Amino acid sequence: MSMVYMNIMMAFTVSLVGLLMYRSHLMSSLLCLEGMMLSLFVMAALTILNSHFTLASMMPIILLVFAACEAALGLSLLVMVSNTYGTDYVQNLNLLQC
Amino acid sequence: MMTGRQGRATFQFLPDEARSLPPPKLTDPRLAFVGFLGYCSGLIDNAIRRRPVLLAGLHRQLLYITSFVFVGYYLLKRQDYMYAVRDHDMFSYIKSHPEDFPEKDKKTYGEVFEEFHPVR
Amino acid sequence: MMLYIVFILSVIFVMGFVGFSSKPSPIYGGLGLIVSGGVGCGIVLNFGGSFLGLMVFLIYLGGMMVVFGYTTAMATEQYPEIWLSNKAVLGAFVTGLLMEFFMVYYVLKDKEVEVVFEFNGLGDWVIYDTGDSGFFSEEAMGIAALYSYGTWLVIVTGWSLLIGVVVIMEITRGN
Amino acid sequence: DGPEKNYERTMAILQIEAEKAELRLKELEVRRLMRARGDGPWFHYPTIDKELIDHSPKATPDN
Amino acid sequence: AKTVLRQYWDIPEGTECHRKTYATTSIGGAAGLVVSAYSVALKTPTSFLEGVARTGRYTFTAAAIGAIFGLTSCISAQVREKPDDPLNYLIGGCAGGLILGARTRSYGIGAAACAYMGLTAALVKMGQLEGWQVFAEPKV
Amino acid sequence: MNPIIFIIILLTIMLGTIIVMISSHWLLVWIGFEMNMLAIIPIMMKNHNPRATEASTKYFLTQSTASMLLMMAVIINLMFSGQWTVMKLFNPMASMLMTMALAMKLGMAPFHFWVPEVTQGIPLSSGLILLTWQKLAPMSVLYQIFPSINLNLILTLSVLSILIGGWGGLNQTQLRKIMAYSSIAHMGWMTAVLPYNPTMTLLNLIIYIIMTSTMFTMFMANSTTTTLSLSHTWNKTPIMTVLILATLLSMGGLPPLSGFMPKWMIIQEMTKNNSIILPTFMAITALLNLYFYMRLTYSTTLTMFPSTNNMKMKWQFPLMKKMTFLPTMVVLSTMMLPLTPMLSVLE
Amino acid sequence: PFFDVQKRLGVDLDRWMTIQSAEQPHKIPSRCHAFEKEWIECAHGIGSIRAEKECKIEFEDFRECLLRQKTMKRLHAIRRQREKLIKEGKYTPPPHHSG
Amino acid sequence: LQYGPLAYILGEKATKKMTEKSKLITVDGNICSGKSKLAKEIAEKLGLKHFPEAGIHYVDSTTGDGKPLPVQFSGNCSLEKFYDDPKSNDGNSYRLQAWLYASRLLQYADALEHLLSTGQGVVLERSIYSDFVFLEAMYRQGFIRKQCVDHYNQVKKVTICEYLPPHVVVYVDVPVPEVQSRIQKKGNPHEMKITSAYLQDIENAYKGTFLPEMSEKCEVLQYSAWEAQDAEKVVEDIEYLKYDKGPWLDQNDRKLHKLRMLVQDKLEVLNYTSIPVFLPEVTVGAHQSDQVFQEFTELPGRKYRAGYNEDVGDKWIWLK
Numbered sequence A: 001m002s003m004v005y006m007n008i009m010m011a012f013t014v015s016l017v018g019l020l021m022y023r024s025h026l027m028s029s030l031l032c033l034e035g036m037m038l039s040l041f042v043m044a045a046l047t048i049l050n051s052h053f054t055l056a057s058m059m060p061i062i063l064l065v066f067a068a069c070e071a072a073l074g075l076s077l078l079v080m081v082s083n084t085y086g087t088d089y090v091q092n093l094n095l096l097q098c
Numbered sequence B: 001m002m003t004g005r006q007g008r009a010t011f012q013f014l015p016d017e018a019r020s021l022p023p024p025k026l027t028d029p030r031l032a033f034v035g036f037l038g039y040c041s042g043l044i045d046n047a048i049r050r051r052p053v054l055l056a057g058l059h060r061q062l063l064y065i066t067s068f069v070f071v072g073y074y075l076l077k078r079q080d081y082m083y084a085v086r087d088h089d090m091f092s093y094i095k096s097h098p099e100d101f102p103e104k105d106k107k108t109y110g111e112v113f114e115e116f117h118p119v120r
Numbered sequence C: 001m002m003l004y005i006v007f008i009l010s011v012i013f014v015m016g017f018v019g020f021s022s023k024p025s026p027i028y029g030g031l032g033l034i035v036s037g038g039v040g041c042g043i044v045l046n047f048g049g050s051f052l053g054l055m056v057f058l059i060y061l062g063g064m065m066v067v068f069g070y071t072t073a074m075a076t077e078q079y080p081e082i083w084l085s086n087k088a089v090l091g092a093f094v095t096g097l098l099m100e101f102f103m104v105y106y107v108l109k110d111k112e113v114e115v116v117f118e119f120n121g122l123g124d125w126v127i128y129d130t131g132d133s134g135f136f137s138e139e140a141m142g143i144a145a146l147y148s149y150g151t152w153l154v155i156v157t158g159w160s161l162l163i164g165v166v167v168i169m170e171i172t173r174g175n
Numbered sequence D: 001d002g003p004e005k006n007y008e009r010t011m012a013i014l015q016i017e018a019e020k021a022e023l024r025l026k027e028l029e030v031r032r033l034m035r036a037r038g039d040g041p042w043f044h045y046p047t048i049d050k051e052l053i054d055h056s057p058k059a060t061p062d063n
Numbered sequence E: 001a002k003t004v005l006r007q008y009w010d011i012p013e014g015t016e017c018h019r020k021t022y023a024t025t026s027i028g029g030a031a032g033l034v035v036s037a038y039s040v041a042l043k044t045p046t047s048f049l050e051g052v053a054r055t056g057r058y059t060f061t062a063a064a065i066g067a068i069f070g071l072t073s074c075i076s077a078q079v080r081e082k083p084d085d086p087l088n089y090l091i092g093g094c095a096g097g098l099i100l101g102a103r104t105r106s107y108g109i110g111a112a113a114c115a116y117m118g119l120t121a122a123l124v125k126m127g128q129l130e131g132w133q134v135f136a137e138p139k140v
Numbered sequence F: 001m002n003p004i005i006f007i008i009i010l011l012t013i014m015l016g017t018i019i020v021m022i023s024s025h026w027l028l029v030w031i032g033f034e035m036n037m038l039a040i041i042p043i044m045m046k047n048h049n050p051r052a053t054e055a056s057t058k059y060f061l062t063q064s065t066a067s068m069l070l071m072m073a074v075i076i077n078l079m080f081s082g083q084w085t086v087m088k089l090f091n092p093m094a095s096m097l098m099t100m101a102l103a104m105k106l107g108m109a110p111f112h113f114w115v116p117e118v119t120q121g122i123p124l125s126s127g128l129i130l131l132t133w134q135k136l137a138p139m140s141v142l143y144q145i146f147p148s149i150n151l152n153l154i155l156t157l158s159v160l161s162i163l164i165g166g167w168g169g170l171n172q173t174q175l176r177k178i179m180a181y182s183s184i185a186h187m188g189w190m191t192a193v194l195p196y197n198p199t200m201t202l203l204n205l206i207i208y209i210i211m212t213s214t215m216f217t218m219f220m221a222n223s224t225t226t227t228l229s230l231s232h233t234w235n236k237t238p239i240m241t242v243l244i245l246a247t248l249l250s251m252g253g254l255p256p257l258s259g260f261m262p263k264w265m266i267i268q269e270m271t272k273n274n275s276i277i278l279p280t281f282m283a284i285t286a287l288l289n290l291y292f293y294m295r296l297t298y299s300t301t302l303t304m305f306p307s308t309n310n311m312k313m314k315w316q317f318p319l320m321k322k323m324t325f326l327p328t329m330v331v332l333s334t335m336m337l338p339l340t341p342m343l344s345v346l347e
Numbered sequence G: 001p002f003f004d005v006q007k008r009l010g011v012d013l014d015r016w017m018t019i020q021s022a023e024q025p026h027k028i029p030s031r032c033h034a035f036e037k038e039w040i041e042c043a044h045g046i047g048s049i050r051a052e053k054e055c056k057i058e059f060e061d062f063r064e065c066l067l068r069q070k071t072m073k074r075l076h077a078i079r080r081q082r083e084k085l086i087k088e089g090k091y092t093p094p095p096h097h098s099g
Numbered sequence H: 001l002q003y004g005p006l007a008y009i010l011g012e013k014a015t016k017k018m019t020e021k022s023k024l025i026t027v028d029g030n031i032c033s034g035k036s037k038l039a040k041e042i043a044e045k046l047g048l049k050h051f052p053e054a055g056i057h058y059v060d061s062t063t064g065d066g067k068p069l070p071v072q073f074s075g076n077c078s079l080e081k082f083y084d085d086p087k088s089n090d091g092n093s094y095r096l097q098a099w100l101y102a103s104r105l106l107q108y109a110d111a112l113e114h115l116l117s118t119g120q121g122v123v124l125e126r127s128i129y130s131d132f133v134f135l136e137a138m139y140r141q142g143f144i145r146k147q148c149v150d151h152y153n154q155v156k157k158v159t160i161c162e163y164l165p166p167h168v169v170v171y172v173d174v175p176v177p178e179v180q181s182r183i184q185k186k187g188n189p190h191e192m193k194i195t196s197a198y199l200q201d202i203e204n205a206y207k208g209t210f211l212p213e214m215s216e217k218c219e220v221l222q223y224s225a226w227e228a229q230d231a232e233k234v235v236e237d238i239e240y241l242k243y244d245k246g247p248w249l250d251q252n253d254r255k256l257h258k259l260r261m262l263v264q265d266k267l268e269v270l271n272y273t274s275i276p277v278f279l280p281e282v283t284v285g286a287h288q289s290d291q292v293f294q295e296f297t298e299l300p301g302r303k304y305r306a307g308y309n310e311d312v313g314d315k316w317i318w319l320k
């Protein structure tokens, strides 16, 4: 657990705390999801590259493939939210009551 | 608790060792009740679709009874197999660890003292 | 010292994260994620994976280019917020850097820090392997095994990307 | 029915219910011992299979 | 919370009432901060000072209830020379219930809180003596 | 939506779940959830109205966050054990994140706020998938990692779910919100017996699915989504109100109905492990569930609410809804207690 | 796996990447191949309850190879002591440790 | 087989059976304006199916043996009593109008099913899109309450949106005095009580609210009483319409498949006509509704699903 793992794990925590504290824009939160995937990619790549786990070297790539699917999926929902209210504000997403 | 049992028959509905056990009798009371549940399904099917409950579609009612009994027979074979395996492991373990299951020293009520509590 | 290049890049990696995690205008948030992607490529590239580092940078450069277009269409206002225009944005930005400073300050002073896990401050170079590989790149040989070993991975990812195109058209159809 | 049939029918009932009671108590003890020590078929949580290992010579000698 | 509870249960009953009051007040105060966090998060205060006021209102109600329980349940076990007696906790629990009534300005809540908090405190003490497990470790 | 595209997207939802159940590698488990979320969302957006857009967006945001935490657990578990096998995790921090990620996916309290809203915002058919099929994959993972799950964490989530689910269901008149809070409460029973006997988790899941699928099928038949809309059923399909009565009584855990079996077996396993205070609290708190099921029987079957004149026009047409497996499901959801020892097949 | 379709069908879908001591391209070994192999062979067929106590030695060495926590602590002490001696002029480094 | 996803996937797609003559035509106008005669002739010349104007007993004509049922099985709504006493306290005015909308809504679904299932056009008389003229007339004359109009819009708002408007709207304009004079000639004792103010409210709704609304979505053809007699002229105008506007140009196989699934499930078409809104006009007590429902199920051939009634000669119940 070298000093690099500290910053990488702190990056994930920052992006997680960033995702759980919305300001207004749904797009601002989507960036935090893509930020979290970046931290997991780096953390997984470091561990795999350092341990010479040869076959695991493809896992980070497969992690980016499904990060794009989620990112594209999140953008597609952002289009429909914008088309209904003219903004991507999350406070408009309150028609459904708990 | 028996998920990892030593029996190397994983993801098999009925392991071949289950063929040493008696099959359920076709007159098994559990199998008759399963068949009865099929008959109730037939009648409820007629009622929700507004048909003569007892008479409508006797062909469909028979398939309800047969389908339930057919599936019920195999669920009973697997049910009895799993309980047979449970006792097999329990007795083997007790035999393999005699110190944990000693034969208690027998006593008679003429020798064992039990406190008496009057009801008055 | 250049012996701490990986650590120095990981500090910028966090600073970029505090850039978009404080959530200013997504225009500036997108810039922050590009900086993190760039340094993240540098960090991975120094552990022996050049394809992985260059690939993640390549994917996130195209990812934020689509996000940029979507920000000018659906996530824009009259006065896009910077890291100084808003107390909530500024408050979260200063807080992130201060925690980064304290973690960096303590790890380089004590050579250790205990937060959930126990981290070591001797330097990232102490865990590298002392043996050389052969005439190939181990990272390249592992990635090239996706087609000979990862038959099941290719199918699920291939099907996922196919359905991904079907799904986005369905979601955005509107009728 | 006569007393004899009921009297000897009760013993058949008590015999079955007594045997099941002993088995119920034994199973609880057997379950307790297997879970605490993990030396029986039950509570046997899997470990990595040894047939996945590769024993052939590697690229480097020290492995 | 494991640390504070172990501190509370290590002090023998009816002794060092100043310390036991510290332990219970900590437990109650922490409970009032957990309630304030969710209340502030789910019911957004109209202003920062309105939310700090709410946090201080709930945290003081929970701290007072915790302080009165440990104090009243410790002197009672001291005067009576009966440490292992659930009746001491029953007295302590009801006193905490009354404090809840005073803070809520409701006689009805004071009576109900005294009855149910009194029983709960007594049941907690019995479980400590008997060995009752709420989250029991799997054994079979 | 093109019928062929609907079928393909439906099979992709199942494939994601099936990948999670057959995967022995953590990466494939994560791929299963990602595939499952990718295919579920278009079925939520099918009717394309603002409420469905909000429901899909809230669902996506919650599930996406959970999948990030699950991947963090896998990577942390990789750093401390150097292997990807789907078994007990080797780090306490990995277990907490994976347990919480699986709690967010299931909608357990205090990660429950989306379940009432997502269910309300999507059609009944989509809601049935949300509350029955989406629970199979997360429950599959918990079944395999339970040895390492912190006992306090899992039992705390179970207790909160039983409380919040019961209380939330009292203040509801929308059927989709009633079924949503009922689902949260039932998740508590599944995960409460998990540390003690994972088999009984499967039993309660199977019985919960059958009963839940029966209620949605009967709500789907009459296109009823509110208490008052369901109150007209007696004047159109009298038989359907009796079936709703029997099923609702079963969901409340009243013997001799089927739904009493999972409670009965869960209490047995917990009392064998000397857990007495928790089963008693769980059973008593479950009376909150039985209360707002009884309230539905009152306005549906046991009384006759006011009708409207146009109802007379509906008497001249039959039910054209498919109502697939409804006659079989209603019987299995009411008369299965005599077959209780058949729970051994799940072992 | 919850359903073990792989084992029955005889198809290897994902077992080939579960451990780092499995067959690798070009027989490239992982840095902790020996340690993982020992822990896997020690704890084969005995369940995790027993392996958690009977194969504790192999698993602790395996974790030492993976994260090198004890080695880095040992290096830290030697490095820290050397600075203290040098800071107070009590130790002269040799040439091969300087150039 | 019964139409569904399987039939659609096997080739039963609406466009493959719809031609340039697959048009939905509606004939509109005031009371006694020749709509029935004009509509019936346009159906014969163009080879289109004709739907007589939906009345209180339309639904009875499509189910069972097709004969009208007693009036208790229709809410006791009477067009006769509306004319005699349009302000009765038993709520017969709006109860009639709400029932008629459900009948037009049902007929329109029947019309769409025929058009989409065989490709043949249909001719309607006062479809759901024009039924609001009578409502606006009843309210302006004090025949129904404000809350009743609120109920009508709520029911209409959740039903009208699911269907497509007719391709061509034929309107037969007639000034009110001509109608009043024509009504008296017809010599129907009840209809003759219609005041002129009521007929003028219908006129304002038709021109001012309806035709402008339908002009932007349909081919609106207007004809006077004198030029409406020769149906040949009207048919000629229809034959040479461009059809350059309206939602029908945006429909394809997927959209029409979803539409056909709705219009064939009649209970789904009528789902929202009985929303739980408790107006005295439409609310029926439990005791009354229970008694009437029991009587309905004991009519010949209506206790069981059609095809399973022995009393009407059905056979093979045990194999059906």
Ligand SMILES: CCCCCCCCCCCCCCCCCC(=O)OC[C@H](COP(=O)([O-])OCC[N+](C)(C)C)OC(=O)CCCCCCCCCCCCCCCCC
Pocket: E107, E108, E109, E111, E112, E113, E115, E116, F277, F280, F281, F284
């Ligand atoms: C492991 C098992 C788990 C069991 C879980 C049990 C869950 C049940 C817990 C529910 C507690 C809820 C308390 C709510 C209190 C509300 C008070 C309030 O708001 O004011 C109401 C009212 C004041 O309201 P009010 O002033 O507006 O007027 C009320 C009258 N109306 C309604 C007309 C307005 O005050 C009360 O009446 C409260 C009565 C206090 C006395 C309570 C004593 C209870 C003791 C237990 C029962 C005794 C029999 C058992 C004996 C046992 C002997 C060992």
Ligand SMILES: CCCCCCCCCCCC(=O)OC[C@H](COP(=O)(O)OCC[N+](C)(C)C)OC(=O)CCCCCCCCCCC
Pocket: E068, E072, E095, E098, E099, E100, E101, E102, E103, E104, E105, E106, E107, E108, E109, E110, E111, E112, E114, E115
């Ligand atoms: C320093 C060391 C201190 C030690 C103290 C010892 C403990 C004593 C604590 C007293 C707290 C206090 O003051 O109680 C006082 C409160 C009074 O009600 P209130 O809400 O204030 O009414 C305020 C009303 N206004 C707003 C109009 C002013 O009681 C109660 O509600 C109790 C009233 C109901 C009686 C309950 C008994 C019957 C039910 C029980 C059945 C088993």
Ligand SMILES: Nc1nc2c(ncn2[C@H]2C[C@H](O)[C@@H](COP(=O)(O)OP(=O)(O)OP(=O)(O)O)O2)c(=O)[nH]1
Pocket: H029, H030, H031, H032, H033, H034, H035, H036, H037, H053, H079, H082, H096, H097, H100, H126, H131, H134, H191
């Ligand atoms: N209150 C009410 N009355 C209606 C409605 N539709 C028809 N009516 C009544 C008005 C008339 O008195 C009667 C017949 O109306 P018509 O439009 O068909 O006029 P008529 O058939 O007599 O001659 P015509 O077909 O136009 O040549 O039915 C309706 O939606 N609401």
Ligand SMILES: [Mg+2]
Pocket: H035, H036, H053
């Ligand atoms: Mg006419």
